[PDB]
Design a protein around this nucleic acid. Sequence first.
DNA 1: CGGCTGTACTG
DNA 2: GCCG
DNA 3: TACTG
DNA 4: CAGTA
Length: 315
Amino acid sequence: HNLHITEKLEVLAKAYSVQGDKWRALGYAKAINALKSFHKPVTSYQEACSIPGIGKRMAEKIIEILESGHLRKLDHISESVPVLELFSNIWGAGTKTAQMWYQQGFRSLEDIRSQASLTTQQAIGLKHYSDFLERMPREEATEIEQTVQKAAQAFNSGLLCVACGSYRRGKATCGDVDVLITHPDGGIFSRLLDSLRQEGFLTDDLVKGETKYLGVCRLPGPGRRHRRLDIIVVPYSEFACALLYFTGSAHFNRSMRALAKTKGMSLSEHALSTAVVRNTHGAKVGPGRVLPTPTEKDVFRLLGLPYREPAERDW
DNA sequence: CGGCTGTACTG
DNA sequence: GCCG
DNA sequence: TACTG
DNA sequence: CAGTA
Ligand SMILES: Nc1ncnc2c1ncn2[C@H]1C[C@H](O)[C@@H](COP(=O)(O)CP(=O)(O)OP(=O)(O)O)O1
Ligand SMILES: [Cl-]
Ligand SMILES: [Mg+2]
Ligand SMILES: [Mn+2]
Ligand code: NA
Ligand code: NA
């Protein structure tokens, strides 16, 4: 962690991101990670250009920060940016929505609350604005997972319940709880949610689909905060690909999916497929065929990769 | 030049 | 923004 | 119980 | 969270 040139660069990345330049923001993201994991502080332009993810433009910015301790770009960042960031931290509102609100003269959450027309998701996002920005301690994630497990167990179906996401990767704090539920390959979802809602445990629903639920829960007692809860239900046949997907991290999933693509394969939460047919844009023409993947290890093996424990997937 | 993951949900 |  | 899928 | 040992 030997490079606080990244603190200035992170400012630019978020600015680009909220203003909608997604790929330039991606470029900075990668450059920032590269510098974060570099063993030593970077003193050199040729040393800088040695790092994958750091090109001439990035290198020029490294040299400028070393020379002046400042970044000329940061000073010229649009004054709309802090407001765009405030708005896009509302769950359900992204860059397009934040920009529209800003164009329309909104400047604070008070403005949004009184004059803005919110979708149902954004209204819930706004009501829990601060809570959605907080991470919980690992132990509280445990209690939430166990609450879902007990509800699932009570149906005496074949339900298996596993906590994924950052929890399964062993993190000390969690932004939400991501729970995977599997049923024998042979309405279960809706009954379960009804159980959790009857207990007073589920307090708001953001998304309810056939495959995924995203919502808000709160444990009993004083000093409790509303916490985000994601639940996915998949057939047992898809277990390993679903566990791999939901375990992440997002960056890890993207790298592994990118590798699969170079191999003429495709990886999603449903399956690993081979002999996939893609056009000149890398867009899928035809689906190829599904490879058997009984465990996570099989996916790595079929990709020609060494296994990584969830702890080693946090990227 | 042009990709940078691949899916689900909403209205 | 970077890189193939 | 400690771990996998 | 059911199964494995
Ligand atoms: N953009 C993306 N592309 C592909 N896969 C993605 C993804 N975003 C999330 N995922 C997958 C992996 C996450 O670990 C998992 C949960 O996504 P998440 O939004 O809960 C982030 P997590 O890794 O759990 O950390 P935390 O902040 O919640 O504590 O879903
Ligand atoms: Cl997916
Ligand atoms: Mg999570
Ligand atoms: Mn989540
Ligand atoms: Na480089
Ligand atoms: Na948002």
